[PDB]
């Protein structure tokens, strides 16, 4: 890659500068380069990677939704479809890049429970983003891949992490979204969200000093979804 000549530490440093400058594409490129050095990522580095690529794909998803809505309205000239397909192709390229990094470099048998859960959650997420724009035979493969990644992350989190852990909570939130929005399973979405919230409250004493703000934020977002869904 184009980051091959740069020291790992310089790449991390530049990802942080890019974050500060809100240059999320640059940030994602710097972190891709850091990952490709083939060393494990710390918590702080996983956050950089996550933030960078979520910003990039988030912008593409929001654009895609705008174009898709215009397209659907005009089916009640080829230009709307063509531009939607262009944005879609770019979005898929970004998801494929992330899934490639996860598969080539980041997902392992060893390491932290946290790290393993986090990367499998990320795999679930970027398959879900592919599923939002998918149509045919490709789609059922994609949905199955998301569920599989999420379900494995869930099994590990439930055995190895407290119920208030932010990765555990964030994973459960995103899986419930999957169930509701992608898998068309509102009952499973609701049950997971409810169970996740109630078990965190029941073991509220497990909140960590260094992450309790994150935990409580996700608990509120679980409650917001539950209110929207019932």
């Amino acid at each position: 890659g184009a980051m091959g000549s740069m020291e790992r530490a310089s790449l991390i440093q530049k990802a942080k500068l890019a974050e500060q400058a809100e240059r999320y594409e640059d940030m994602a490129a710097f972190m891709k380069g850091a990952v490709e050095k083939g060393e494990e990522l710390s918590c702080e580095e996983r956050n950089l990677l996550s933030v960078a690529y979520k910003n990039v794909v988030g912008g593409q998803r929001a654009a895609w939704r705008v174009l898709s809505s215009i397209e659907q309205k005009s089916n009640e000239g080829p230009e709307v479809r063509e531009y939607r397909e262009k944005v879609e192709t770019e979005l898929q390229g970004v998801c494929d890049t992330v899934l490639g990094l996860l598969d080539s470099h980041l997902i392992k048998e060893a390491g932290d429970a946290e790290s393993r859960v986090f990367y499998l959650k990320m795999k679930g997420d970027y398959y879900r983003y592919l599923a939002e724009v998918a149509t045919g035979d490709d789609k059922k493969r994609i949905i199955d891949s998301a569920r599989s990644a999420y379900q494995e992350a869930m099994d590990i989190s439930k055995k190895e992490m407290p119920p208030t852990n932010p990765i555990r909570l964030g994973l459960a939130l995103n899986f419930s979204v999957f169930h509701y929005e992608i898998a068309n399973s509102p009952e499973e979405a609701i049950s997971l969200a409810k169970t996740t919230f109630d078990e965190a409250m029941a073991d509220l004493h497990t909140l960590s000093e260094d992450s309790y703000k994150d935990s409580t934020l996700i608990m509120q977002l679980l409650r917001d979804n539950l209110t929207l869904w019932t």
């Binding site: 996550s50 933030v51 997420d125 995103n174 994150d214 977002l221 929207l228």
Partner: peptide, 10 residues
């Protein structure tokens, strides 16, 4: 309205 997923922080 869309379901809310995990946001970006820190």
């Amino acid at each position: 309205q869309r379901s809310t997923s995990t946001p970006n922080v820190h």
